[PDB]
A = this chain, B = another copy of it.
Amino acid sequence: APTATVTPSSGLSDGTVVKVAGAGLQAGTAYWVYQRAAVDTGVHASNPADLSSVTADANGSASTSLTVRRSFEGFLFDGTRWGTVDCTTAACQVGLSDAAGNGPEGVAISF
């Protein structure tokens, strides 16, 4: 199954740059690399401002840089502006999803 890692994923400050890496992804496919938090069970609010992506190489691997924030203006997948999200108490993680919502499990990060 698809895996992902965020290094470093702890002791992060606002504006910190981390490396997001995916493995066991499908070659050639694009995966949205983004910061998020579940404002409801199974319902994620993300940060498009610093969003980015990645296309798994022939071995289904890829990594990139992501700028994380302690707090960010979160939007839902349906486009709705949810509101400001403070990762200080919210369980923010870095997601890796393709255009159909598939990919590895979100990686918990903390500040």
Q: Given the complex, which residues of B lie within 8 Å of A51, measured CB to CB? A: 48-49, 51, 75
Which A67-107 residues have a C-beta within 8 angstroms of B?
75-81, 97-99
Interface pair B49/A79, CB less than 8 Å apart: no
A55 within 8 Å of B by Cβ? yes
Residue count of chain A within 8 Å CB distance of chain B: 20
Task: Please name the residue on chain B nearest to A80 by beta carbon.
Answer: B30
Q: Given the complex, which residues of B lie within 8 Å of A77, measured CB to CB? A: 99
Interface pair B98/A31, CB less than 8 Å apart: no
Q: Given the complex, which residues of B lie within 8 Å of A48, measured CB to CB? A: 48-49, 51
A52 vs B53: C-alpha distance in the bound complex, in angstroms? 18
Q: Could you tell me which A residues sit within 8 Å of B by CB distance?
A: 30-32, 48-53, 55, 75-81, 97-99
Please provide the 8 A-B residue pairs with the shortest distance between their CB atoms, ordered closest to farther. A30-B79, A30-B80, A78-B99, A48-B51, A32-B79, A48-B48, A53-B79, A53-B81
